[PDB]
Amino acid sequence: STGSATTTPIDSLDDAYITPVQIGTPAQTLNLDFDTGSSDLWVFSSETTASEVDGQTIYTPSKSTTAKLLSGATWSISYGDGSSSSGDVYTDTVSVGGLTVTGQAVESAKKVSSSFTEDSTIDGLLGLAFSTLNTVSPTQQKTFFDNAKASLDSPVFTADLGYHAPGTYNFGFIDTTAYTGSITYTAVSTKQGFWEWTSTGYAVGSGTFKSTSIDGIADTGTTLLYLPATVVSAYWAQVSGAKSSSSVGGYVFPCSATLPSFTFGVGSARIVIPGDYIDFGPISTGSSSCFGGIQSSAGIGINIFGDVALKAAFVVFNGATTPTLGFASK
């Protein structure tokens, strides 16, 4: 089997991407944030504290004839950005782009933190990291990909995120028309539960490539590109007037600037992030100071190849017995 679904930016800045997901019988369609940095499929629901729901579409398990309460199971998650959610668990039928999993754990939120409430466009998350990170207790549950894998034509999914435009998540096949050149594959460590890999280096604009190992994660659920302070300093030094602002919480730059590209290495291959992808707009409405899309990972404890990087590529998440990651230009 295969599936294919369009993923759409939630706003004009590509702050995140939503993909429609069918849950239950009859189908209830929710727009979920596909997150290769986490491993829970959780949704706003009829059980969510009323004051914490503001515009989201909810899953109502009582209206699904295939929903079954998973007895005694609870979940609770906290994300790198400080947001969190928790609740109980159903199993139900979940379909993405024509690909169907029966008995998928659907984590129904009883509580969500303010940032989720405040974002009317995201109805929940669909985790695509390794199932070892799944928070369901006392019996850990499998991700949608883990459940689908054996049925797929090939045990893979691909992320093709758009810049200010729709893109695609495919399950079970590689669309060879969706990228240019070849896909370069690179080793993955699953030891921390992530799609963790090592970039071979970077360049700023038309500058010479610096060969240096950068361990990080491919994370569709993180907006920006978080890299070591040395790398980030080298990038922003090429932008007149750019500075790290403690009050804003990262590098900012004059909105009148034209940003240089940023290149990262995947083996001997190179992915070029155009400068415009690094512009995240005014720090506050009407400001002429703009927030940068490349930020320091110092104090995160890990480098994160978030959407800023991933949207510059066609990315293969290869779930073979030994997982690997593939990157192509597009």
- Residues 193-229 as b or e (16 or more Cβ within 10 Å = b): bbbbbbbbbbbbeeeeebeeebebbbbbbbbbbbbbe
DSSP string, 191-238: TTSS-EEEEEEEEETTSPPEEEEEEEEE-TT--SEEE-HHHHHHHHTT
Dihedral sign for Cα atoms in the order 54, 13, 107, 152: positive
CA distances 266 to 82, 169, 187, 206, 212, Å, are 30, 21, 10, 18, 11
Resolution (A): 1.5
In the residue annotation, 81 being an active-site residue is answered as no
Catalytic-role residue among 85, 95, 199, 296? 199
| Domains contained in the chain, CATH given | 5-174 (2.40.70.10), 175-330 (2.40.70.10)
Nearest-Å Rg of the Cα atoms of the chain is 20
Task: Kindly give the pairing relationship between strand 289-292 and strand 243-245.
Answer: unpaired
* Peptide bond before residue 138 is cis, with ω within 30 degrees of 0: yes
Residue 62 CB neighbour total at 10 angstroms: 9
Tokens of 263: 């290149």
Longest dimension (CA), the chain: 60
State residue 28 phi and psi, 5-degree precision: -115, 115
Catalytic-role residue among 14, 33, 35, 92? 35
Quick one: which of 201, 137, 124, 126 has its CA closest to 171? 126
User: What technique was this entry resolved by?
Assistant: X-ray
Residue 132 CB neighbour total at 10 angstroms: 12
In the residue annotation, 199 being an active-site residue is answered as yes
Distance CA 39, CA 232 (A): 29
CA triple 59-65-71, angle to 5 deg: 75
CA distances 52 to 106, 109, 110, 205, 234, Å, are 19, 10, 9, 44, 42
Tokens of 216: 């990080």
DSSP structural state of residue 137: B
